[PDB]
Amino acid sequence: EKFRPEMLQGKKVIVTGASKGIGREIAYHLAKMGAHVVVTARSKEALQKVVARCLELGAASAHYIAGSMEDMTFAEEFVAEAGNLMGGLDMLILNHVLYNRLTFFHGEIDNVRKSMEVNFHSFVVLSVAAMPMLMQSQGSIAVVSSVAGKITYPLIAPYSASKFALDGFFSTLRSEFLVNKVNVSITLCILGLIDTETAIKATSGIYLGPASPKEECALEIIKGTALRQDEMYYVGSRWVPYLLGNPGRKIMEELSAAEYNWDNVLSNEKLYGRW
Amino acid sequence: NEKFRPEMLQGKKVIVTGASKGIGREIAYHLAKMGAHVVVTARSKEALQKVVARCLELGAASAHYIAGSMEDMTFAEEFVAEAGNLMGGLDMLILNHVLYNRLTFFHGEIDNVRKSMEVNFHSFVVLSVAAMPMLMQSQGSIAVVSSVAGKITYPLIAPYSASKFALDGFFSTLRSEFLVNKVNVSITLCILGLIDTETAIKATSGIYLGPASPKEECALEIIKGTALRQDEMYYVGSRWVPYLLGNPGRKIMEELSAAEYNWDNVLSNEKLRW
Amino acid sequence: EKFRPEMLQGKKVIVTGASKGIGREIAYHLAKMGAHVVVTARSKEALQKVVARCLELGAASAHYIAGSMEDMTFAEEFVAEAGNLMGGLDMLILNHVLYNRLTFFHGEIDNVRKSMEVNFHSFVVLSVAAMPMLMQSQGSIAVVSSVAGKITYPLIAPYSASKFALDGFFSTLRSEFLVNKVNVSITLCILGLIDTETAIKATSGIYLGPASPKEECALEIIKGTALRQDEMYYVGSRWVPYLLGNPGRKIMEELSAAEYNWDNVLSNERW
Amino acid sequence: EKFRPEMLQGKKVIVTGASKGIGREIAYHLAKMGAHVVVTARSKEALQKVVARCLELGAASAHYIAGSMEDMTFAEEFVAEAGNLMGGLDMLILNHVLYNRLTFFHGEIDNVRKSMEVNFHSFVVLSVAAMPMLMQSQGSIAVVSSVAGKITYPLIAPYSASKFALDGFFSTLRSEFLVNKVNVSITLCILGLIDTETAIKATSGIYLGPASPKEECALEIIKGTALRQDEMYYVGSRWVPYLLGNPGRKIMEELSAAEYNWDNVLSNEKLYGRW
Ligand SMILES: NC(=O)c1ccc[n+]([C@@H]2O[C@H](COP(=O)([O-])OP(=O)(O)OC[C@H]3O[C@@H](n4cnc5c(N)ncnc54)[C@H](OP(=O)(O)O)[C@@H]3O)[C@@H](O)[C@H]2O)c1
Ligand SMILES: NC(=O)c1ccc[n+]([C@@H]2O[C@H](COP(=O)([O-])OP(=O)(O)OC[C@H]3O[C@@H](n4cnc5c(N)ncnc54)[C@H](OP(=O)(O)O)[C@@H]3O)[C@@H](O)[C@H]2O)c1
Ligand SMILES: NC(=O)c1ccc[n+]([C@@H]2O[C@H](COP(=O)([O-])OP(=O)(O)OC[C@H]3O[C@@H](n4cnc5c(N)ncnc54)[C@H](OP(=O)(O)O)[C@@H]3O)[C@@H](O)[C@H]2O)c1
Ligand SMILES: NC(=O)c1ccc[n+]([C@@H]2O[C@H](COP(=O)([O-])OP(=O)(O)OC[C@H]3O[C@@H](n4cnc5c(N)ncnc54)[C@H](OP(=O)(O)O)[C@@H]3O)[C@@H](O)[C@H]2O)c1
Incomplete structure (x- = not known):
C-alpha cells in the first residue's frame, strides 16, 4: 500500500x-503534486509569497485567507470560504x-489559556466546520502534534x-468514526x-538533541495522512516511536471496546445528531 | 517506602x-475520621452544609465550606485564599x-468542549497556582483526580x-520541573x-457494561497515594490493568530525555515566582 | 489615593x-472603564478589530487612525484628528x-536612527501636539519605557x-512643569x-526567565497614570524597582533645584 | 595603575x-605629551590656531579637518581622512x-532633533567609522557627557x-565588547x-553653581581614557560622583548577565558580523 504523489493531484x-x-x-509539496490549496495564517504578505510560490510549483490552484486562530468565528468562517474557493x-x-518559548x-495562567485556545480549541472548531465537506468526500484530517504530546x-x-x-x-x-463507519480518517502526527x-x-543551547529536516517532515505528514494512518511518527529515530506509541494503550482500547452495549449504543438515537 | 498511617493527616x-x-x-x-482540618467546596450550599456537619461528628479538627462554581476563575482564586485563612x-x-456530559x-x-476544559482543566490550574505559596511553605501535596479516560x-x-x-x-x-528545581511539593495523578x-x-447505564469499584475505598486510596507523595495512583478494579495504562515507554523516555538538557544554562539562569 | 475605574469613565x-x-x-481596559478611546498603529485591519472589541467591551466611543510614527507629519496630524474625534x-x-531581535x-547606524525616530522623536512630537488640549484638561501623559531605559x-x-x-x-x-505649576502629569512606566x-x-532561547502578564501590565500603566505618579514600575519583583529607581538621583535633583536663581528665570519665558 | 604622560607619546x-x-x-595636553592629533570642528581659522599651538607645544604631528557633525557623511569621511593622516x-x-540655551x-521640536543629531547620532557614526582602526590598535573611545546625562x-x-x-x-x-572580549575601551566622562x-x-545668572577649571578637566578626561576606565567623574566634589554613579544599576547589570544563554547567544550563529 505505497504512497504516490498522484494521490493528491486535484x-x-x-x-x-x-x-x-x-x-x-x-x-x-502539495503544489508540486498538483493539488488545490488554501493556506492560512496571520501574516498576509507571507501568505501571498507562499501562494505565488505554490502556483509556480504547479499547484492546481492556490489561495490564502489571513486571520488569527485565537478567533473562533474566523476559524469557522475560514473553512466555509475555503470550501467555496475550491468547491x-x-x-x-x-x-x-x-x-511559545522554553x-x-x-x-x-493567561499563557495556558491562550495556548489551549490556539493549539486546541481552534483545531476542534475547524474540524467541526469542515466535517460535512469531509464526510461527502470521505476525506482526511491531519492533526499536527509533538513528542511533547x-x-x-x-x-x-x-x-x-x-x-x-x-x-x-x-x-x-477516530474511535467513534470507526464504530459508526464514518469514512473520514484522522491522522495524529507526532x-x-x-x-x-x-x-x-x-531551543538552540538548551535542548541539545538533533533536529530533523522540515522538508522531509512535511512530506511525511502528507504521506501518512494520504495513506489514512492513525498516527505518523517523525522523531529522528526508527526506534523511539515504539517507546512513544504505548502498546499497552492500544491493547486496552481494543479490549475495552468489548465492554460496550453496542446492541444498544449503535441503535440509540439520543447518542446521535449531526453537524 | 514506607507504609501509610492515618496519623499522617491528623492536624x-x-x-x-x-x-x-x-x-x-x-x-x-475519611479526612474527618483522621482528624484533619478540611475546607470542602462545590456549588450546592445545602449539600456542603450536610457534609461539614457530618465531618465534625466524624472527628474533623475543623470543617468549613465555601460554595461556588469552578467555571468562574475569580472564584477559584478567591476560594483558595479564603480557605487558607480559615485554616491558617x-x-x-x-x-x-x-x-x-451524557455519554x-x-x-x-463545541460549547461542551469549552465548558469541560474550563471546569475540568483550567480551574485545576488556577487553584494550583493560587495554593502554591502555601503549599511550598508547608512542603505540601496536590492530588489531581483523573480517569482511565485520561x-x-x-x-x-x-x-x-x-x-x-x-x-x-x-x-x-x-512535577518534572519541581523535581529539577528541588521544589518539595508533591503532585499525585490519580487514575x-x-x-x-x-x-x-x-x-454509563445500558451503555457501558464494565464493572464499578466502591467509592469509599477509592477515596481512601486517593488520600493514601497523595499522603505518600506518589507520582501516580491507580485505582481501576484490576491489579494488572495499571501496567497497561502506565506506559513503561514514556517513563523510560522521560528519564532519558532529561540528559538532553543543558542544565547549566537552565538552572543557573534560575534567578527568578507566583 | 486609591485608584477607581470611575477615574476613567468619560x-x-x-x-x-x-x-x-x-x-x-x-x-x-479603558473600554471596560467606559472611556473614549482613539487607537493608533500601522495596521488598519488589526486596529479595526480592536475598535470593534472596545465597543463591545463598553467604551463610550472608539475610533482608529492608521499610520506610521516614523512620519512626524502623521504624528502631528494624528493628535489633531484624534482631538476632533473626541472633542x-x-x-x-x-x-x-x-x-529588534536581539x-x-x-x-x-540606520537601525539606531530609525529606533530614535520611532521610539523617541515621535513621542516628543505627539506630546507637543497634544499639550494644548492636555493643559486645558489638566490631563496626563504615559511614557511607556523599559528596564532597559x-x-x-x-x-x-x-x-x-x-x-x-x-x-x-x-x-x-516634568521638573519644568512643576516649577511652572503646569498641571499636566507625566508618568514614566518602567x-x-x-x-x-x-x-x-x-528573547526566546536567549532569556529563559519569567515574563509578567500583559493584561495586568496594561492595567498598572493605566492606574499609575491616572494617579499621576512620576514613575510606575512593573518588573516582576517588589524589590527590583528600588535598585532601578536610583535614590541618589532623586536626592540630587531635589537639592540642585536650590542652585537656581528663580528670580532671573521664572520672571521671563508657548506651543 | 598610575597614569604617565608617556602612555600617549606617539x-x-x-x-x-x-x-x-x-x-x-x-x-x-595631548601635544605636550607628544601625541599625533587630528582636531576637528566647524571653524577653520580657530582650528588652524589650535594646530599651530599644538606643534609649538610638542605634538608629534597635528592636522585639522573642518566640518559640521550635523552632516553624517562628513563624520564618516572625517574618520577615514584622519586615519590616513596619522596612519x-x-x-x-x-x-x-x-x-544650547537655558x-x-x-x-x-527642531531643537530636539538637531541636538540628537549633533550630540548623539554623530557620536555613533564616528565610532562606527573608527572601530576597525580601534580594534586593530586595541584603542579607546572617550564619550564626553555631563551630570545632565x-x-x-x-x-x-x-x-x-x-x-x-x-x-x-x-x-x-561596552557590555557587548566585554562579553565578546573585544579590547576597545569605552570611557564615559561625566x-x-x-x-x-x-x-x-x-548659565551666568541662572545656575549659581561653582565651575571647575577646564585645563584640569581636559587632563582628567585624557587620564581616565588612557587608563581605560568605564566612567570618569569630574564634577567639583569628591562625594557627588557616588550619588550619580548609581550603585543599584551596577549591581543589576552584573546580576542580569547571568540571565543570558550565552551558548545560544555566543552561538546563536548570526548575532555577529562586522563593520
Ligand atoms: N518545529 C518543531 O521542532 C516541532 C516539534 C514538534 C511539533 N511541532 C509542531 O509542528 C507544527 C508547526 O511547527 P513549526 O515549527 O513549523 O511552526 P512555526 O514555524 O513557528 O509557525 C507555525 C505557523 O502557525 C501560525 N500561527 C501562529 N499563531 C497563529 C494564530 N494565532 N492564528 C493563526 N496562525 C498562527 C504561524 O503563522 P503567523 O505567525 O503568520 O500567524 C506559522 O505559520 C506545530 O503544530 C508544532 O507544534 C514542531
Ligand atoms: N465516578 C467514576 O467512575 C470516575 C471515574 C474516573 C474518574 N473520576 C473522577 O473522580 C472525580 C469525582 O467523580 P465523581 O463521580 O465523584 O463526581 P460526581 O459524583 O459527579 O460529583 C463531582 C463533584 O464535583 C462538583 N462540581 C460539578 N460541577 C462543579 C462546578 N462547576 N464548580 C464546583 N464544583 C462542581 C459537584 O458538586 P456540585 O454539582 O454541587 O457543584 C460534585 O460534588 C472526578 O474528577 C472524576 O473525573 C470518577
Ligand atoms: N514586551 C515587553 O517585555 C516590554 C518590556 C519593556 C518595555 N516594553 C514596552 O511596552 C511597549 C509595548 O510593547 P509590546 O511588546 O506590547 O509591543 P508590540 O507587541 O511589539 O507592538 C507595539 C505596537 O507598536 C506599533 N508600532 C510598531 N512600529 C510602529 C510605527 N512605525 N508606527 C506606529 N506604530 C508602530 C505596533 O503596531 P504596528 O506594527 O501595526 O505598526 C504595535 O501595535 C513598548 O514601548 C515597549 O518598549 C515592553
Ligand atoms: N562646559 C561645561 O560646564 C560642560 C558640562 C558638562 C558637559 N560638558 C561637555 O563637554 C563637551 C565640551 O563642552 P564645552 O563647554 O567645551 O563646549 P564649547 O566650548 O561650547 O564648544 C564645543 C565644541 O563643539 C564644536 N561644535 C559645535 N557644533 C558643532 C557641529 N555642528 N559640528 C562640529 N562641531 C561642532 C564647537 O566648534 P564650532 O562651533 O566651531 O563648530 C566647539 O569646538 C560637550 O560635550 C559638553 O556637553 C561641558
Whole structure:
C-alpha cells in the first residue's frame, strides 16, 4: 500500500499555519503534486509569497485567507470560504501553533489559556466546520502534534497540555468514526525536533538533541495522512516511536471496546445528531 | 517506602473540591475520621452544609465550606485564599470536581468542549497556582483526580477525555520541573476506573457494561497515594490493568530525555515566582 | 489615593501602538472603564478589530487612525484628528515601539536612527501636539519605557539609547512643569519582560526567565497614570524597582533645584 | 595603575569639538605629551590656531579637518581622512556638542532633533567609522557627557535627552565588547560645570553653581581614557560622583548577565558580523 504523489493531484486541501516552517513546506509539496490549496495564517504578505510560490510549483490552484486562530468565528468562517474557493474539501491539515518559548512555569495562567485556545480549541472548531465537506468526500484530517504530546518535557507545560488534549479528543473521535463507519480518517502526527527557524531559536543551547529536516517532515505528514494512518511518527529515530506509541494503550482500547452495549449504543438515537 | 498511617493527616490542612457528593464527599469523611482540618467546596450550599456537619461528628479538627462554581476563575482564586485563612495554611490540595456530559457520540458540541476544559482543566490550574505559596511553605501535596479516560480513549466522552489528557500533560510537566528545581511539593495523578458514584452509574447505564469499584475505598486510596507523595495512583478494579495504562515507554523516555538538557544554562539562569 | 475605574469613565484617551501587545490590552481596559478611546498603529485591519472589541467591551466611543510614527507629519496630524474625534484629550498613552531581535551591535547606524525616530522623536512630537488640549484638561501623559531605559543590557543598544533618551527628556519636562505649576502629569512606566508575542519571540532561547502578564501590565500603566505618579514600575519583583529607581538621583535633583536663581528665570519665558 | 604622560607619546588621537573650550585644552595636553592629533570642528581659522599651538607645544604631528557633525557623511569621511593622516588611530575623543540655551521647553521640536543629531547620532557614526582602526590598535573611545546625562535639570531637556541617549548606547556597547572580549575601551566622562566661555555665558545668572577649571578637566578626561576606565567623574566634589554613579544599576547589570544563554547567544550563529 505505497504512497504516490498522484494521490493528491486535484485534491482540495487546507493547510493552516502555512506562512512559514513545516506548514509552508507542506504547501510547497502539495503544489508540486498538483493539488488545490488554501493556506492560512496571520501574516498576509507571507501568505501571498507562499501562494505565488505554490502556483509556480504547479499547484492546481492556490489561495490564502489571513486571520488569527485565537478567533473562533474566523476559524469557522475560514473553512466555509475555503470550501467555496475550491468547491469542496478532501484534506484538512491542522498545523498552526501559538508562539511559545522554553521557561519554567511560574503561574502564566493567561499563557495556558491562550495556548489551549490556539493549539486546541481552534483545531476542534475547524474540524467541526469542515466535517460535512469531509464526510461527502470521505476525506482526511491531519492533526499536527509533538513528542511533547505523548510524553512530558520540562519547560513547556502550557504547550504540552494543549497537545495532550489533542490526542485525547481526536483519538476519541477516530474511535467513534470507526464504530459508526464514518469514512473520514484522522491522522495524529507526532514530531520530534524539526529544524524550523522558530524551533531552533527556542531551543538552540538548551535542548541539545538533533533536529530533523522540515522538508522531509512535511512530506511525511502528507504521506501518512494520504495513506489514512492513525498516527505518523517523525522523531529522528526508527526506534523511539515504539517507546512513544504505548502498546499497552492500544491493547486496552481494543479490549475495552468489548465492554460496550453496542446492541444498544449503535441503535440509540439520543447518542446521535449531526453537524 | 514506607507504609501509610492515618496519623499522617491528623492536624493537616486540606482542601477538597467537588465534595458535596460522590468520591469527594467520601474523601472529606475519611479526612474527618483522621482528624484533619478540611475546607470542602462545590456549588450546592445545602449539600456542603450536610457534609461539614457530618465531618465534625466524624472527628474533623475543623470543617468549613465555601460554595461556588469552578467555571468562574475569580472564584477559584478567591476560594483558595479564603480557605487558607480559615485554616491558617494548607498542606494538601485535593482537586476532585468535574463536569460530566451524557455519554454521547460527538457531533459539534463545541460549547461542551469549552465548558469541560474550563471546569475540568483550567480551574485545576488556577487553584494550583493560587495554593502554591502555601503549599511550598508547608512542603505540601496536590492530588489531581483523573480517569482511565485520561490515559486511553473511550468512545462517547471526547470532551471529558480531552480535559483529562490535558491534566496529565500539564501536571506531569510541572512535577518534572519541581523535581529539577528541588521544589518539595508533591503532585499525585490519580487514575480511576469506573467508581460506583450515583452520577457515574446513571451515566454509563445500558451503555457501558464494565464493572464499578466502591467509592469509599477509592477515596481512601486517593488520600493514601497523595499522603505518600506518589507520582501516580491507580485505582481501576484490576491489579494488572495499571501496567497497561502506565506506559513503561514514556517513563523510560522521560528519564532519558532529561540528559538532553543543558542544565547549566537552565538552572543557573534560575534567578527568578507566583 | 486609591485608584477607581470611575477615574476613567468619560475620559478622552489616546493609545498609540494599540493593534497588539500591551497597547491593545490598554485599549481593552479603558473600554471596560467606559472611556473614549482613539487607537493608533500601522495596521488598519488589526486596529479595526480592536475598535470593534472596545465597543463591545463598553467604551463610550472608539475610533482608529492608521499610520506610521516614523512620519512626524502623521504624528502631528494624528493628535489633531484624534482631538476632533473626541472633542478634547485627557490622557495621552505613548506606547508604540520598534523592536529588534536581539543582536550584538556591529555598525547598524540606520537601525539606531530609525529606533530614535520611532521610539523617541515621535513621542516628543505627539506630546507637543497634544499639550494644548492636555493643559486645558489638566490631563496626563504615559511614557511607556523599559528596564532597559534605566540600566543597560547586552544586545539592544539602539533600543536602550532611545529609551534612556525618553527618561532624559520627559523627566526634565516634568521638573519644568512643576516649577511652572503646569498641571499636566507625566508618568514614566518602567516595564520588565512582559509576555507579548513580540517580546517572547525576540528573547526566546536567549532569556529563559519569567515574563509578567500583559493584561495586568496594561492595567498598572493605566492606574499609575491616572494617579499621576512620576514613575510606575512593573518588573516582576517588589524589590527590583528600588535598585532601578536610583535614590541618589532623586536626592540630587531635589537639592540642585536650590542652585537656581528663580528670580532671573521664572520672571521671563508657548506651543 | 598610575597614569604617565608617556602612555600617549606617539599615540594617534582624534579630538572633535577642539576649536575652543575643553576640546581645545584636550588637544593642548595631548601635544605636550607628544601625541599625533587630528582636531576637528566647524571653524577653520580657530582650528588652524589650535594646530599651530599644538606643534609649538610638542605634538608629534597635528592636522585639522573642518566640518559640521550635523552632516553624517562628513563624520564618516572625517574618520577615514584622519586615519590616513596619522596612519591609524589609538584614541577617539568625542567631545563636540550643539550650542544650547537655558530655557523652559516650549515645543522646540527642531531643537530636539538637531541636538540628537549633533550630540548623539554623530557620536555613533564616528565610532562606527573608527572601530576597525580601534580594534586593530586595541584603542579607546572617550564619550564626553555631563551630570545632565545622569540626572535631570530644568531648562535643558533637548541636551539632556541626547546625553542620556549616549549613556544608554555606549554602556550597552561596552557590555557587548566585554562579553565578546573585544579590547576597545569605552570611557564615559561625566562633567560638572566647567569654566568654558560657552558654559559660563549660558548659565551666568541662572545656575549659581561653582565651575571647575577646564585645563584640569581636559587632563582628567585624557587620564581616565588612557587608563581605560568605564566612567570618569569630574564634577567639583569628591562625594557627588557616588550619588550619580548609581550603585543599584551596577549591581543589576552584573546580576542580569547571568540571565543570558550565552551558548545560544555566543552561538546563536548570526548575532555577529562586522563593520
Ligand atoms: N518545529 C518543531 O521542532 C516541532 C516539534 C514538534 C511539533 N511541532 C509542531 O509542528 C507544527 C508547526 O511547527 P513549526 O515549527 O513549523 O511552526 P512555526 O514555524 O513557528 O509557525 C507555525 C505557523 O502557525 C501560525 N500561527 C501562529 N499563531 C497563529 C494564530 N494565532 N492564528 C493563526 N496562525 C498562527 C504561524 O503563522 P503567523 O505567525 O503568520 O500567524 C506559522 O505559520 C506545530 O503544530 C508544532 O507544534 C514542531
Ligand atoms: N465516578 C467514576 O467512575 C470516575 C471515574 C474516573 C474518574 N473520576 C473522577 O473522580 C472525580 C469525582 O467523580 P465523581 O463521580 O465523584 O463526581 P460526581 O459524583 O459527579 O460529583 C463531582 C463533584 O464535583 C462538583 N462540581 C460539578 N460541577 C462543579 C462546578 N462547576 N464548580 C464546583 N464544583 C462542581 C459537584 O458538586 P456540585 O454539582 O454541587 O457543584 C460534585 O460534588 C472526578 O474528577 C472524576 O473525573 C470518577
Ligand atoms: N514586551 C515587553 O517585555 C516590554 C518590556 C519593556 C518595555 N516594553 C514596552 O511596552 C511597549 C509595548 O510593547 P509590546 O511588546 O506590547 O509591543 P508590540 O507587541 O511589539 O507592538 C507595539 C505596537 O507598536 C506599533 N508600532 C510598531 N512600529 C510602529 C510605527 N512605525 N508606527 C506606529 N506604530 C508602530 C505596533 O503596531 P504596528 O506594527 O501595526 O505598526 C504595535 O501595535 C513598548 O514601548 C515597549 O518598549 C515592553
Ligand atoms: N562646559 C561645561 O560646564 C560642560 C558640562 C558638562 C558637559 N560638558 C561637555 O563637554 C563637551 C565640551 O563642552 P564645552 O563647554 O567645551 O563646549 P564649547 O566650548 O561650547 O564648544 C564645543 C565644541 O563643539 C564644536 N561644535 C559645535 N557644533 C558643532 C557641529 N555642528 N559640528 C562640529 N562641531 C561642532 C564647537 O566648534 P564650532 O562651533 O566651531 O563648530 C566647539 O569646538 C560637550 O560635550 C559638553 O556637553 C561641558
